[PDB]
Design a binder for this molecule. Structure first.
Ligand SMILES: [Ca+2]
Lengths: 277, 285
């Protein structure tokens, strides 16, 4: 009853129509399976990183985590093969305003709920998996804009880039990191703004955050028509609290979100999606 | 060399709000820690090994169009399989509840047929190949957006007491099972499913006795392919009938692989704009 599943090995010649996108991410189609897939692909110890990530994704399978379809492991080529995500990332949805002038509230709330469901699952694994690199860029959107959490490069078992989602206690090297990033994401989702807009240098962000400053909360950033505004602001504020001991577990955060999500009729989620490009 | 994923064990007491759905009994529940709805398939020490077998198959056969297993509930007082909850029921209910669903748009029907084929294809391409052997509309589950999840691997086999059920999806040569049964069982079932999807009709509707069906089918009778069952306005009608007729051939050897079916379906699906799938789902809500 120690039931085990093995991650399939995919021969490079099976990845037909390799095309560059944005590690290096490429799209392909599996020759036998007949599905479009995504491939993430020099060195000798950078191999251990890729295998480690592929193992994490394979072990963390869940409804809101990016599904891994297999590993392409050869002398010639090394890659992680995952389901293709046609709608990109949450970053693109919130910030490409001419492509997406309207992102209805029900869908924004659904995304916020699913992100939390995914991280909660990771934290409940045995032993707990901490993501440690959550950002709008790493929340992928499937064909119907359901969430798939990706990029397990910095993830850790509990046994240089953008710093806007990083809790201050991390600038001078915790189970309370993900919730902090989640709070910033929530603010970003509800405002459609870039956290710390007017800041020209990332060291100014790091300094400000270390002194307890946070993305701005007022009528311009978070308009009064936001459903359940006061309740969302409390969640955001508790999530990015300076003292990490005062930040909530994902359990508590889900218990708070559940009644908020019940106020949206199911069909409103579908209608929010159809309205998109 | 191999990277392994272990199936979680879920304590019975973590399943809150247990409610009966089907009578293997199917129940709904919410997981106390994960905060998601789930489906639980359980009994009302040898009927135990059957469950563990199916759980293992679901766990090994993970793919985009196969029902995800979330864990196994294995205790002295309770044994069951925990899977993702499918809010839109089965393909069977979508096709035959005509009052609830007066219209089921062609693009959605075709996407369903396409996704079933992708699912079975994936199984057939495993090492060693997995054969479902119990496909039916009742076992094609639908998620929130009506995407396919293939379920019920109870009779499935790795190619290396009797429970009462319909025989309509069973190929005639399986009526008295041998050692050879066979990679060509699934395609026969798919062919009947395809006919049932395009017609929204119960196969062998006229025949009241299940045993009579078995006679007819061995004698070569198939579900009726005429105008009343498959109207002329059906998108790509000729090409679908050709797919069906070859799929349920009396001789297993003439029946096509799923790969072949895919190749045939890929151009058909490209004739439907993305928007039409979303419209079809909104229409069903
Ligand atoms: Ca209706």
């Amino acid at each position: 009853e120690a039931i085990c599943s093995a991650l399939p090995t995919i021969p490079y010649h099976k990845l037909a129509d390799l095309r560059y996108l944005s590690g290096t991410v490429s799209s392909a189609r599996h020759a036998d399976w007949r599905v479009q897939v995504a491939v993430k692909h020099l060195l000798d110890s950078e191999r251990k990183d890729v295998l480690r990530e592929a193992e994490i994704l394979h072990k963390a399978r869940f409804s809101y985590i990016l599904p891994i379809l297999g590993i392409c492991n050869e002398p010639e080529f090394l890659g992680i093969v995952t389901e293709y995500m046609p709608n990109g990332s949450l970053n693109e949805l919130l910030h490409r305003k001419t492509e997406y002038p309207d992102v209805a509230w029900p869908l924004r709330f659904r995304i916020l709920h699913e992100i939390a469901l995914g991280v909660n699952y990771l934290h409940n694994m045995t032993p707990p998996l901490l993501h440690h690199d959550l950002k709008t860029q790493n929340i992928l959107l499937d064909n119907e804009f359901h969430v798939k959490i990706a990029d397990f490069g910095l993830s850790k078992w509990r046994m240089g880039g953008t710093i806007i989602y990083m809790p201050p206690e991390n600038y001078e090297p915790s189970i309370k990191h993900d919730i902090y990033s989640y709070a910033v994401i929530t603010w970003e989702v509800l405002s459609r703004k870039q956290p710390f807009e007017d800041v020209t240098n990332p060291l100014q962000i790091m300094y400000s955050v270390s002194q307890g400053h946070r993305p701005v909360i007022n009528e311009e950033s978070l308009p009064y028509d936001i459903p359940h505004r006061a309740r969302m602001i409390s969640l955001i504020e508790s999530g990015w609290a300076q003292n990490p001991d005062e930040r909530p577990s994902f359990l508590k955060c889900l218990i708070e979100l559940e009644p908020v999500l019940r106020t949206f009729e199911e069909i409103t989620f579908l209608e929010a999606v159809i309205q998109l490009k």
